């Protein structure tokens, strides 16, 4: 009795960590006197940010 099946919504599988693969970022902070000036932030924050 071939009546097909519910298939209305896509089903998905994801990494153990949720997110999956990532890249390394340095922080930056803005120069306040400029409209578009930035300066690295290596103060209390890590240089290897995920």
């Amino acid at each position, epitope marked *: 009795e071939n009546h097909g099946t519910e298939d209305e919504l896509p089903n998905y599988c994801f990494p153990l960590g949720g997110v999956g693969n990532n890249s390394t970022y340095t922080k930056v902070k803005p120069k*306040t006197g400029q409209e578009n000036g930035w300066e690295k932030d290596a103060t209390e924050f890590s240089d290897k940010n995920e």
Partner: single-chain antibody
Amino acid sequence: DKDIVMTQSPSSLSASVGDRVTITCKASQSVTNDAAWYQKKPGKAPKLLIYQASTRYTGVPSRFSGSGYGTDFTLTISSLQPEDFATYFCHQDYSSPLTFGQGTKVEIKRQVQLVQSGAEDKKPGASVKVSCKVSGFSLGRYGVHWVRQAPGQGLEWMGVIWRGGTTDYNAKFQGRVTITKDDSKSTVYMELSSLRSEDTAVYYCARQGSNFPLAYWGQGTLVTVSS
């Protein structure tokens, strides 16, 4: 939350035809490589010389040059001429509140447009509104500053309205300043309140680059206040 004070020495200089000239600026705190040098004629708005403590603007002669880093910076004229006898300004665009120095005096030895409103005067304990009609650029793309010079004193930065419509003020003056703008008749407005004799000054419209020091200026509006 600490003030960026530009202390310019020596205050005056006296010079003759073909002379080598040197001015030095000492900042309160580090501003890194971002420091700007200006030349100003008495009544007329500044002209940009040096930026990034060594780079020349478009049409700046070969005889002007800068040097220095961190807190100390120097402005040098290789071999001076009568055109160069004006009053000079140290400046930093590194952090907003933007600041200028005291303004030194070199004296003899014996397309983008900013048009402001007409001059005027009023009595202490009132309020004034000055205009700056803009042309040759969109106010959404570039924030607009306000500067003023009290008679024969330094340059006092009043405020800025940044490209999104965010205002930013020199909190030292108690928040007397209010900057507005109209995208539809492309104008920026400066409205000042609780007027006193110490506020008598020429009031200047100004604009930055992409992200480099102030370079496009109004004609100035003389506001006089007498007791």
